[PDB]
Design an enzyme around this catalytic site. Structure first.
Site, mmCIF file in Angstrom:
data_model
loop_
_atom_site.group_PDB
_atom_site.id
_atom_site.type_symbol
_atom_site.label_atom_id
_atom_site.label_comp_id
_atom_site.label_asym_id
_atom_site.label_seq_id
_atom_site.Cartn_x
_atom_site.Cartn_y
_atom_site.Cartn_z
ATOM 1 N N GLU A 57 -8.288 16.072 128.156
ATOM 2 C CA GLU A 57 -8.908 17.451 128.839
ATOM 3 C C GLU A 57 -9.508 17.733 126.925
ATOM 4 O O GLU A 57 -10.129 18.137 126.604
ATOM 5 C CB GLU A 57 -8.452 18.555 129.214
ATOM 6 C CG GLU A 57 -7.838 17.597 131.010
ATOM 7 C CD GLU A 57 -9.777 17.990 131.244
ATOM 8 O OE1 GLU A 57 -10.773 17.846 130.824
ATOM 9 O OE2 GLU A 57 -10.124 17.186 132.695
ATOM 10 N N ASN A 75 -20.584 22.468 129.949
ATOM 11 C CA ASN A 75 -21.458 21.787 130.670
ATOM 12 C C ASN A 75 -22.853 22.115 130.891
ATOM 13 O O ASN A 75 -23.351 22.417 130.924
ATOM 14 C CB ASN A 75 -20.946 21.979 132.255
ATOM 15 C CG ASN A 75 -18.823 22.038 131.949
ATOM 16 O OD1 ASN A 75 -18.175 22.753 132.173
ATOM 17 N ND2 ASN A 75 -18.806 20.469 131.869
ATOM 18 N N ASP A 101 -24.519 22.434 133.919
ATOM 19 C CA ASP A 101 -24.986 23.459 134.581
ATOM 20 C C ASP A 101 -24.542 24.619 134.276
ATOM 21 O O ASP A 101 -25.088 25.625 135.067
ATOM 22 C CB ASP A 101 -23.728 23.169 136.199
ATOM 23 C CG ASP A 101 -22.986 23.783 135.689
ATOM 24 O OD1 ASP A 101 -22.259 24.221 134.405
ATOM 25 O OD2 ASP A 101 -21.744 23.196 136.807
ATOM 26 N N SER A 138 -22.423 25.754 132.709
ATOM 27 C CA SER A 138 -20.823 26.903 133.222
ATOM 28 C C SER A 138 -19.768 25.946 131.233
ATOM 29 O O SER A 138 -20.575 25.074 131.053
ATOM 30 C CB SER A 138 -20.226 26.531 134.169
ATOM 31 O OG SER A 138 -19.498 24.731 134.238
ATOM 32 N N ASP A 162 -16.115 24.758 130.445
ATOM 33 C CA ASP A 162 -14.232 24.649 129.888
ATOM 34 C C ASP A 162 -13.992 24.901 129.213
ATOM 35 O O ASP A 162 -14.479 25.000 127.962
ATOM 36 C CB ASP A 162 -14.550 22.919 129.974
ATOM 37 C CG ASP A 162 -14.572 22.378 131.029
ATOM 38 O OD1 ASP A 162 -14.924 23.046 132.247
ATOM 39 O OD2 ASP A 162 -14.852 21.192 131.131
ATOM 40 N N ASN A 168 -12.958 25.844 133.503
ATOM 41 C CA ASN A 168 -14.178 26.091 134.268
ATOM 42 C C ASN A 168 -14.390 27.296 134.786
ATOM 43 O O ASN A 168 -13.938 27.717 135.359
ATOM 44 C CB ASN A 168 -15.036 25.290 135.618
ATOM 45 C CG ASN A 168 -15.990 25.440 135.204
ATOM 46 O OD1 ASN A 168 -16.926 25.132 136.005
ATOM 47 N ND2 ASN A 168 -17.230 24.478 134.122
#
Ligand SMILES: [Cl-]
Ligand SMILES: [Cl-]
Ligand code: NA
Length: 129
Positions: free
Chosen positions: A35, A46, A48, A50, A52, A59
């Site tokens: 990750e 991301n 959308d 959002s 991380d 998220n």
């Protein structure tokens, strides 16, 4: 902070992740490697809108508030910036809530694609735990 492999394993043990909800410590170390490359500062946007955050790439739509993700639920009740600290406590506490939600560690895409079904104990081999 960029952790070493065994240093992170020890910190995650100290914080109760070994065998949490049945996931052995190697699973958590493997997830963190893929990750974030063990970097607490890691961030990734991301499609959308959002983002991380941190060692376990938590998220901003569901779990933390970053002030720029409309409709965020903030289920861990923390600013996303708290997940970037050299102290992993906030990331671990939020991860415990995520892994308990029903889908286990499948919530972490990199775990499902790169750790699940592999010899995850290799990630803690050699470490003094
Ligand atoms: Cl820590
Ligand atoms: Cl499970
Ligand atoms: Na293991």
């Amino acid at each position: 902070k960029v952790f070493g492999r065994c240093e992170l394993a020890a910190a995650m043990k100290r914080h109760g992740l070994d065998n949490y909800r049945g996931y052995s410590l190697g699973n958590w170390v493997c997830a963190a490697k893929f990750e974030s490359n063990f970097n607490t500062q890691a961030t990734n946007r991301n499609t959308d809108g959002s983002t991380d955050y941190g060692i376990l790439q938590i998220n901003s739509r569901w779990w933390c508030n970053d002030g720029r993700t409309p409709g965020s639920r903030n289920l861990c009740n923390i600013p996303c910036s708290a997940l970037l600290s050299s102290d992993i406590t906030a990331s671990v506490n939020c991860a415990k809530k995520i892994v308990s939600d029903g889908n286990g560690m499948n919530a972490w895409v990199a775990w499902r694609n790169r750790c699940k079904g592999t010899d995850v104990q290799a990630w803690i081999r050699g470490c003094r735990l």
